[model samples]
Target: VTAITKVEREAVLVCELPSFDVTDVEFDLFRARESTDKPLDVAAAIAYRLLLGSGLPQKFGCSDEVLLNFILQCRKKYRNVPYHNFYHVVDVCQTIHTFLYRGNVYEKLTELECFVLLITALVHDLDHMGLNNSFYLKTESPLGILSSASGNTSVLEVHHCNLAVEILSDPESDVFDGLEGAERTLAFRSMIDCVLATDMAKHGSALEAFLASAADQSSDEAAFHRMTMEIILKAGDISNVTKPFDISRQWAMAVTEEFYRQGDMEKERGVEVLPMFDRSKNMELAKGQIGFIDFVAAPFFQKIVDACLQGMQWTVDRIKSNRAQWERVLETR
Candidate 1:
């Protein structure tokens, strides 16, 4: 889910500076597999194996370190809200892996595409300050100004993606030293494009593109590729809404907290906070999620099953389940 309860989210990300282990994060994997089965656990194990003897010291990969640093910096610069914390990144990885397998997208992913998806999931919210685009546009935060005062959230998103990749490139971090020119560039650019496109501002346009991709019925290579790309990226963005209800509700609460954090800042600075972004203001969040699931996710997933009948019915179900969960929340919260 997009937000998480404090305890559930912390199950993986509690690794502080010294003497923590990647193995520590597997607990959530275990919990997830108990409900959803073992694909994510398998993928996570593969990830650890793939990373072994690689970018980390003695089988300990430093991706977490890089992620931790980004979270800290984002917190210091923006606010201490924990919605987009390292836990959120880890949760995204888990959620995407879940969707990938549930959709049978796993069987189709290439090594490069798999790596790209994993990296995109991990880095998607890298350095996010839990502040929405509306904050930057309305309040003229320095990040807003430095991003050229462009009202497009894409400007700030692009900046954050670049900064994350730069961290990836650092010799100490060393995530991509082995790949050569075009492959490396493609992976990097694809990741940046996918991640930066997650802004709420891009939601409508992104859904439109997904619909266009969904319209193509030919099994031609071009159509296949377009459909695959749309399914992968779109699922990555909305997979949270399709997860377990408890997890989904947890995420919603965390997002509300983040929104309230933004509202607090706006109040301090004498600017109006965006209405929906405030937790106390609690405008139709679950209702919005229901609309998103109905109008966007359902249509794209239908295209997926129509194109390749073997996969994604489960994902389609989860999307409906998730929407119903939100409906429940709307009634209760």
Candidate 2:
């Protein structure tokens, strides 16, 4: 609730990021995490490097002090979940950085839109509890009950937005504080839209809308821009499949473990369990990963690249590479 003070920022060493380059889209955050025992500090430093490199803070007249405070606050809000923790958001931020800069997606939008996208990456999963929205609604948890009553099915996305709003309430942590009028409102609205779009529950609708808008970006400028931001964040959210095999495999393990834990909880409560999540089913990780790539991740990157993000064809290529590697796993088995 309180603002992160300058002393806290100064206390963490802001040295050069080990094996990380702001311009290099292939930078491995997993390697960066392995390089330091203080992973959270390293994640914050990485965010700082990317944000500073963007020059959006300076462009928008946001002081470096305030930006640092905002990042620190955002970091504190993320819990120590297996996959949806601080490291995941930092990876998403880094991935989106690549999409915008190296992939040349920045040319399609204004600097302010890119700025909101990066900041939204940092806060997109704020205060995650290592559980999916299905768990909450299935158990009829209080927050889930509230979400159902409000008719917002993207439960966790709404929770993240609430925390994001809370963080921005503090003047010291408001990254968009320097803006006024329509620009400021647009920034907040667009940022929330991007974050909420990260929820996979709405993945089909979101992707359809984005691809539709991207078909002819010249038709509706505002809608195109907004959908572009949404799709970029969505791509970042599920980007593990698009990384190198080693990195992608590590993320798969983390997510699988997290999913199994959720299944464990649901079993304890006598809730219906999906086959993949049912521990009794003895699912093979390799098969599960291949199915995910084929059904969920592959078509997504392929279509998005075909749509307008052709510069990001590298993502599609990597997805193919990782899929083959997972197939190798099944072959060996």
Candidate 3:
């Protein structure tokens, strides 16, 4: 039902963005968004430019119009959630670009795999309602019930995959339309695999699986490529901690607000809420960042970079820097 016309494409093309380098790891999308009243259009343009500039789309036979159509198709589907909205996906795309180009991770995969990773970032969190998978499961929401019935706990990721496939079904927005034969099949499957692995529930095992694969010198070439793609996308999904201090703080605050809203809704529905999500917990943003870095973000980035992705050492360094800043806040108070 989402048809992207020429008007949509031109609308984004006309606005020369706020002049930040979209591909730089240090690029601040938050500043760019607030610089204009048309933040949505700005976001669309950011994504539009990121893909077109990557030059990957052209290699895959995607015309500029086709890519724009795909961007608009994705933009229309993202609800205005606090954290996992259009901007967040665009952030992921740009972040993945940094990981690929800035870190030179591109050498590890074929052009096709690289293309799928960027596309996967856009569609990974489609239509996120600012709530989480656990929310739906606890509430027995329609989509969650279907997921429960289907034996897949990926409540949001599955829905995202459905919509992503729907958008690609139309030629106008089918960025992968140029591929034929096995390449075409790989594109769809790899994108889905990357998105599905984004479920935090599977984070540990996914990292373990990837780490195991990366360590083996005789790893199957194709399977290694697939898992590498999966890990990079997962990196992008949680790259906020790898950002500059202020930027990371902003991202942390937005997620906190989203979690607070889910908690508010849970109370209204008589469901139990975790303390982190509970508004009354008086959780400080510093503690949230500290806890996350201590348990999840730090270890994940450290292991991946130390194990195989040496080029991505900066991410690990930034995460440590951010963690220390958060620690200072707690110590001073």
**Candidate 2's residue-wise lDDT over 1-333, tens digit each?**
776766679755465675568567567888888887777888888899889889899999899888989989998888877898999998999999999988999999999999999999999988888889999999999999999999998899998999999988888889999999999999999998888788887899999988888886376899899999999999998999888788888998999888888899999989988987777888988889889999999999999999899899999999888888888888888
TM-score, cand. 1: 0.68
Please list the residue runs of candidate 3 whose C-alpha ends up more than 4 Å from where it truly belongs after superposition.
none
Alpha-carbon shift of residue 277 in model 1 (angstroms): 2.6
**Index of the highest-lDDT prediction:** 3
Q: In terms of TM-score, which candidate is strongest?
A: 3
Minimum summed lDDT over a 10-residue window in model 3 is located at 1-10
| lDDT (C-alpha) at residue 279 in model 3 | 89
Summarize candidate 1's per-residue lDDT along 1-333 as a digit string, tens digits: 022234432432432223223332122432433443433333233334323312332322335443333333322232235576655555665555555554556665555655566556655665577777667767776777866545455655776676666556554444554467886786676777677667766666666665555466544653444345545665656655656666666666777777777888888889976676556665766776777678776776666566553565776776777777677777887
Cα deviation of 138 in candidate 1 (Å)?
A: 1.0
What C-alpha lDDT values do all the predictions have? 0.56, 0.88, 0.91
lDDT of 1 at 68: 36
